[PDB]
Amino acid sequence: MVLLESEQFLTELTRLFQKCRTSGSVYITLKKYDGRTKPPADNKCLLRATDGKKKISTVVSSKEVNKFQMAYSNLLRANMDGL
């Protein structure tokens, strides 16, 4: 799976929406993440996006939240149209 930089997750997610206009669903899972990498900080959130076939993800933490929040919130708005 594609674990990406906070910044690059957006240019990917934005490119994903554009594949799934004439068809396909686009999911965005978002949850609190404890850094776990196998079966102990808790200050991180995790975002997965997928169209059923290609998966992308990224972890956002305090340092990059204000930047992300804005460009993501602003991203969604520009791509969740047709309503």
Place this chain on the structure above:
Amino acid sequence: PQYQTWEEFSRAAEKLYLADPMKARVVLKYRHSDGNLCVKVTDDLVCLVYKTDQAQDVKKIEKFHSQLMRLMVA
């Protein structure tokens, strides 16, 4: 249990989160070809869901996602 009054849906969602944040997850699903979207929030016992095809919600929702990161992060 689906909601209609968005502003209540949030009021539940955030409580469901606050109750067990490392359990609770939050899904969003958009489908341009049907011109509608859905928003789900759930730990694996309780489930809260909100479907809509209304442009006005995108803002509430983006400012909800925006609201939740904060709390997960800090």
Place this chain on the structure above:
RNA sequence: GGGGCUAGGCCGGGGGGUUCGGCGUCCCCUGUAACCGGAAACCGCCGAUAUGCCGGGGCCGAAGCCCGAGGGGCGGUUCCCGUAAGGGUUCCCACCCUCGGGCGUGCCUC
């Protein structure tokens, strides 16, 4: 208990379409912290022991894995009432828990 191994396990699951039937490429509904690469509807691996094949990697490691019952829950679906919107209902079911079984719980060392 600590250390070194190996057997093994996980890296998704389900519904539709199609099939004589079981997987896959297609469509759809959904999980994970969690796989990369290749081919495949003139078809690819299969035969009720069928629940994919080939190539490469990571993690876990005697860890687990599988079968059954119920409960939570999602998306479908059967049937019935209604003119309709709706309402009741049958059977599946991602995801989660409880209980009950089956195989395994190995080798070396301090």
